[PDB]
């Protein structure tokens, strides 16, 4: 299972979508492209860090919802 080519595909799709974007959408997509380039340069370390942050948020959220353990 590869991750780098999927990220390249995502960046290319975002570039394709940028053409039909409005001003605010264009700025947001530019920030997103910068984020993807930062992930690419960082060798997926920042990406995995953000994934771990979100997963930690979720994994802290689950056990609190067990009202009747």
Among 25, 30, 43, 45, binds other proteins (CB under 8 A): 25
Question: Could you tell me the smallest distance in angstroms from the CB atom of residue 38 to other proteins?
Answer: 14
CB-CB contact of 44 with 55 (8 Å): no
- Contacts for 32 with CB less than 8 Å, ≥ 6 apart: 14
Structure tokens at 37: 């380039």
By CB under 8 A, is residue 31 in contact with other proteins?
no
By CB under 8 A, is residue 3 in contact with other proteins?
yes
Question: Could you tell me the smallest distance in angstroms from the CB atom of residue 16 to other proteins?
Answer: 6
């Amino acid at each position: 299972t590869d991750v780098r080519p999927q990220l390249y595909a995502l960046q290319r799709f975002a570039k394709a979508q940028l053409k039909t974007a409005t001003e605010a959408e264009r700025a947001a997509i530019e920030a997103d492209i910068a984020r993807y380039q930062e992930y690419l340069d960082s060798d997926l370390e920042k990406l995995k860090q953000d994934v771990a942050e979100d997963t930690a948020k979720k994994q802290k959220l689950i056990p609190l919802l067990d009202r009747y353990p």
